[PDB]
Structure 1
């Protein structure tokens, strides 16, 4: 199951470490590609996430940055019509 918020984002807690195999643009504010860029997570780097979201065509993970701000990044596609996931863009440990 998933919790749901006022933007219709499906979300819950999950804690793991994600290492992308390609550069990924990270977002502030929320799990949408239209949100501002926080930075770039380079292939091979690792973030430790505490939240997972289904929104805007993707599964996103959320973490807290060094400035105390929330950061959001997409790790694979999510087709809401079928609840089908795409290939993971890296590895999770």
Structure 2
């Protein structure tokens, strides 16, 4: 049925399973169909990409160390904050941007709704300004 879209655990919106057709039938062979995205143990997929996010509309409470909807709290991003991130990750439900604070901790912001699977992510309602 599917080749590699599996992750039997409930991290957030896992076990949705959308893969097959011809994605790993003959195997990636130096060409994964997930694009530039790499997989994380939580089921999250992430790609290195530097872009900017200017927070606005609302102060966004961020998650630290791991992207989930029930992920660790204690990071809150105020509006008017210009965040230059390096990690773009998909935790099914939102797209999360990974950035590091001066404490050396990895903080993730939920930024906008995103559904889908790497590379094609379907955005929804945004709560900030992507730059």
Q: TM-score, normalised by structure 1?
A: 0.86
Gaps of 5+ in 2: 1-34
Higher strand share: 1
Which structure exhibits the higher relative contact order, with contacts defined as CA atoms closer than 8 Å and separated by 6 or more residues? 1
Query: Across the two proteins, how many residue pairs are aligned to each other?
Result: 93
Gaps of 5+ in 1: none
- Measured after TM superposition, the shift of residue 84 of structure 1 is 1.6
79-88 or 33-42: bigger deviation: 79-88
Rg larger for = 2
Q: TM-score, normalised by structure 2?
A: 0.64
User: After superposition, where does 1:1-93 map in structure 2 within 5 Å?
Assistant: 1=35, 2-21=37-56, 22-80=58-116, 83-93=121-131
CA RMSD of superposed structures (Å)? 1.8
